[PDB]
Design a protein around this ligand. Sequence first.
Ligand code: X0P
Ligand code: X0P
Lengths: 147, 147
Amino acid sequence: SPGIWQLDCTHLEGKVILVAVHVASGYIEAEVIPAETGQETAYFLLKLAGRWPVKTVHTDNGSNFTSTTVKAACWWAGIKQEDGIPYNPQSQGVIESMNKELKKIIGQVRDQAEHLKTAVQMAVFIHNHKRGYSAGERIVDIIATDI
Amino acid sequence: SPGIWQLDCTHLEGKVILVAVHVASGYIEAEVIPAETGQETAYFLLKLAGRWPVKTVHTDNGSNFTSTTVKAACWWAGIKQEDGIPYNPQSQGVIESMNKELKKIIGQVRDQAEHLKTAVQMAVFIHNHKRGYSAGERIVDIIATDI
Ligand SMILES: COc1ccc(CNC(=O)c2cc3ccccc3cc2CN(C)Cc2cccc(OC)c2C(=O)O)cc1
Ligand SMILES: COc1ccc(CNC(=O)c2cc3ccccc3cc2CN(C)Cc2cccc(OC)c2C(=O)O)cc1
């Protein structure tokens, strides 16, 4: 579980927000892309795995699970690519609630920047710092304990 | 020192590679941009500070130190913006050696992707994983100990 991440795709302003959640901590990384493609998802995972010790990724949908480009990136980066079927039924709700919360924060910062990507990174900041520990503190502690 | 980062700008293929180094560990994050502007640097720092507990940034040059946009991002993200004058003379050499090493790795992966940004993220991955601890292990341990 220190190495388990979940992909999540949500939409705002006609754009796509791609999110990776570290399941055990709730820590997130996110980016804005014009549309979800295999190449964009692959590049996002490459970035993620260079920054955190990503062992397993639960993909957000069947297209990214199938994508040969995503599979290639996971091979390159030493990631076990898995499906994202909510075997635990709590998972749907948790991701739903995360997207709602993220969109709420984005709304609270949206008039502080021209570009959606800026607002999204502000929201990532606020989410990861929110406390009692923050998600950023939890991920570091979990991984440090594992090392 | 757990919160101290150094900015670094290097050039390849007519593009700019912007690098943030966590000084105590050698862990890096990096991105490719067409040129180093205040807005790009500001956005890069916002991303960084949402992902790690960035307390202090030593800026890479006087233009980024002066930039009101960079100062605004540092204000927003709770970062102390400082100059990057190598008071310790070993600092020049260490950054010089880091850029040379990064360019070497980029060369070793360059034919595995069309786009420079992909090669740069491959290089970030290799750098942070290289072992005896890796930079990625060191940064997590340093920060966890601090928390
Ligand atoms: C991350 O560094 C900062 C630094 C300062 C601020 C404070 N906010 C403003 O100064 C502002 C507020 C606006 C509010 C409504 C409409 C337009 C706006 C345009 C602006 C000016 N721009 C240049 C900010 C900006 C900078 C760098 C990259 C950016 O995007 C890549 C953007 C952006 O605008 O997204 C936000 C973020
Ligand atoms: C990170 O995910 C992967 C997945 C697979 C590979 C294996 N490499 C190739 O398949 C390849 C090698 C090339 C070698 C010389 C010239 C062109 C090339 C074009 C390609 C095909 N592209 C689509 C890879 C690619 C994918 C996603 C985003 C990308 O950039 C944003 C690029 C890119 O090309 O930069 C690398 C990285």
